[PDB]
Design a protein around this ligand. Structure first.
Ligand SMILES: O=C(O)Cc1c[nH]c2ccccc12
Ligand SMILES: O=C(O)Cc1c[nH]c2ccccc12
Ligand SMILES: O=C(O)Cc1c[nH]c2ccccc12
Ligand SMILES: O=C(O)Cc1c[nH]c2ccccc12
Ligand SMILES: [Ca+2]
Ligand SMILES: [Ca+2]
Ligand SMILES: [Ca+2]
Ligand SMILES: [Ca+2]
Ligand SMILES: [Cl-]
Ligand SMILES: [Cl-]
Ligand SMILES: [Cl-]
Ligand SMILES: [Cl-]
Ligand SMILES: [Cl-]
Ligand SMILES: [Cl-]
Ligand SMILES: [Cl-]
Ligand SMILES: [Cl-]
Ligand SMILES: [Mn+2]
Ligand SMILES: [Mn+2]
Ligand SMILES: [Mn+2]
Ligand SMILES: [Mn+2]
Lengths: 233, 233, 233, 233
């Protein structure tokens, strides 16, 4: 029943549900079957940066993911989010493991939404997460720690990631993501992540998403559904 | 039981509870008995701008209130808010009427909090308020409308303000206002207001305040207590 | 010899140089012959707002122009500005009159450029212009005044605009608009304008532009060339 | 003939010109004889962060310098900069060596100035410096490199710092630092630095400063004068 717009960093090819035959970044409009994808070389144990950009003028949801060595993947998709999202939303991060696993560690997260009419703005930045993060809604296995990081999916004491895990972090305050009379409705999101795995293959990935205010983890949305969708339709 | 730090725009002299013999702006640390005040010429029916500034280095809570014609009042008070406030807070606007009354109309409100260590940031801006303002907590008589304004205290259909009124607006998300390891903890707040009264004297005023997350209007905090304090101590 | 990327608010149809048969907004890549245009209802004597948005991910230069009554025109054009502009630029506003004329009054101008790698930023905002505006380069007839406005084209003492006029304002500091290793290079510009004319038709329009550092008004670039181009090619 | 307001990170005690008997941070109003100082433990070879804060309401110039291990020094001084500085200024960084020496390496520098009336803003951020930094004015020995850093004072090929060196970096654009009608005139500056020395004692230090537009290195302002002052008065 949730409405989802997401950028997925998808570490695991699930070819039978329309994934390409490689790790990819994807734009997901109300379906895990990405509307557009690009090949992504996920660098095990390295800190990546994801950037997400939209404005209501160009009506183009863009994402780019890069690592320090400079290797980057970009994906863009033409979509009017006025026709997709509710006016009011929550913004969040989601990650899953299944049969295979990885750390889904968030080191930092920033977001900006603006409505310019004829301005209303929300901006937050986390470069360190604290134990009792009162402006975050933690769902499922997602924890904030003393190490200053957001662990979306459960990690063992020994620092090793665990399978069949799902967790999300949503910003506490609802966001006014569009308003019919806004001349420009724009949002930007950036997060840094550390995906590390000793597994034969890492899985399943990390998503930035926008949803209805009351959005919660769909039941059985572990693994390939990235904690966003109740099925693969 | 609430902990309150406020800047009060006090339109009504209550001399028996330590108000000066004129309308004033005041810095209130856990008491309506302002720690410091300055004379303020409130201009009936005109749009004022209040600016509030603090940083943990100078440890000086400053406020200035001005009108378009340029007449301004300033008040500063040396205080370590690390020693006053809880780590996590909500920020809000409050206004009251009593025996005398005024419009307590907010046309715009912006806030920025930052912690710089060895950055975490929250920024919001409302230049228009909407009917269902999902990122605001409205308490008491406070309403948001189609006129794009926040009415802290009850106004009649005919546009006239009503007595014995109290309302507040708090931003939905808790704010991390200080952190022991922050090198610089700073906040800025700005709001524009229209106080108008056909009364013999306007009352009672408008406050920007910071409180515990779960802060609510103290019972009988109408009139001279500005919806912040349960008594005049 | 200058390299120009501009958004033109074109009040006058010059049909013989590829203008449409109506006032329009246009994206100009190294030619006054706009790569893309949209019909624009210019509202005589009213304050308009222009917004310009680009990012190096979507590679889409977008502009929207609106007035308070809400009537707006939008134009978008897919272009890699890494392949058009020099790395370092100046940003500016330009306006012209010819055989016909108008006020080309700028009431406010803001700009933001960012490079995010694996951040460098420039932001300025003018909501009032002063007599000796030391962070602006004024070219041709462009003046700043006590009325707090930038007059791009010459106005008489009696407040009436004059024909065959050209003036520009460039921000003093060069801008690093792209860098080969930037993951995201983005810029946003906003300005408010008042075009007013008692003429049979207004002319010629206002442009936001990006150029080489040493860009100057091309000789004979009054009227339909908007002070940007030395010819209509 | 220059007018100087500076925060000095002073690594070398020059006791005969009013330095305390230890490395210190200082607020300098038109004199190298700091109006106020605080003891500073400079950590050889470590990256420090300096923060500078002023607003025209509190009228308190504050500085804090810290290192990752959390050791920090703070100094505040009550001063009306409306009565000290010209309306228009340039902002910059300065460093010197003399008989003793150190690296005066700047890794990052950000600045924000705002005038709020009844807003004009300038903001820049350098987290990487490039070889041809067109928005910086380099004076004396100051160089920008491929290592992404600003070297205020001359360093040998072998990476060792050199004595009797002075260099400054000023932002290209003049800043409107105060305006008589501004309700709030505020500025913030942050820079990160790496001072390293194999010398018996490091010298001489790094300063953030504000000056007249046409400010240049005073002759013989190497060593204890930090490239800011022509004498020790
Ligand atoms: O830019 C200005 O000075 C006026 C202004 C503030 N907010 C605005 C939103 C839309 C159009 C104009 C403005
Ligand atoms: O300024 C930089 O480039 C590094 C940096 C980012 N956030 C900081 C907070 C405190 C000290 C340094 C930094
Ligand atoms: O986001 C962070 O905490 C680290 C960071 C600061 N500037 C950056 C630019 C690109 C990628 C990561 C960062
Ligand atoms: O805050 C608003 O909506 C109006 C506004 C924009 N700039 C200002 C500067 C001073 C006082 C009010 C405003
Ligand atoms: Ca998958
Ligand atoms: Ca009172
Ligand atoms: Ca034309
Ligand atoms: Ca010294
Ligand atoms: Cl599968
Ligand atoms: Cl399924
Ligand atoms: Cl009383
Ligand atoms: Cl009482
Ligand atoms: Cl023509
Ligand atoms: Cl021609
Ligand atoms: Cl000496
Ligand atoms: Cl001397
Ligand atoms: Mn996928
Ligand atoms: Mn009072
Ligand atoms: Mn045209
Ligand atoms: Mn000294």
């Amino acid at each position: 029943a949730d409405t989802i717009v997401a950028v997925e960093l998808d570490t695991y090819p699930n070819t039978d549900i329309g994934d390409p035959s490689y790790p990819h970044i994807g734009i997901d409009i109300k379906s895990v079957r990405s509307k557009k994808t690009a090949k992504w070389n996920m660098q095990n144990g390295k800190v990546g940066t994801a950037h997400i950009i939209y404005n209501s003028v160009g009506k183009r949801l863009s994402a780019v993911v890069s690592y320090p060595n400079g290797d980057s993947a970009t994906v863009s998709y033409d979509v009017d989010l006025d026709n997709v999202l509710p006016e009011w939303v929550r913004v969040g991060l989601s990650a899953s493991t299944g049969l295979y696993k990885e750390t889904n560690t968030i080191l930092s997260w920033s977001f900006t939404s603006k409505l310019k009419s004829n301005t209303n703005a929300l901006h937050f930045m986390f470069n360190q997460f604290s134990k009792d993060q009162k402006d975050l809604i933690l769902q499922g296995d997602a924890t904030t720690g003393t190490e200053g990081n957001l662990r979306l999916t459960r990690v063992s004491s020994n620092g090793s990631p665990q399978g069949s895990s799902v967790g999300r972090a949503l910003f506490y305050a609802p966001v006014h993501i569009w308003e019919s009379s806004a001349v420009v409705a724009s949002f930007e999101a950036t997060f840094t992540f550390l995906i590390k795995s000793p597994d034969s293959h890492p899985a399943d990935g990390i998503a930035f998403f926008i949803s209805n205010i009351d959005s919660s983890i769909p039941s059985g949305s572990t693994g390939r559904l990235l904690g966003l969708f109740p099925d693969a339709n």
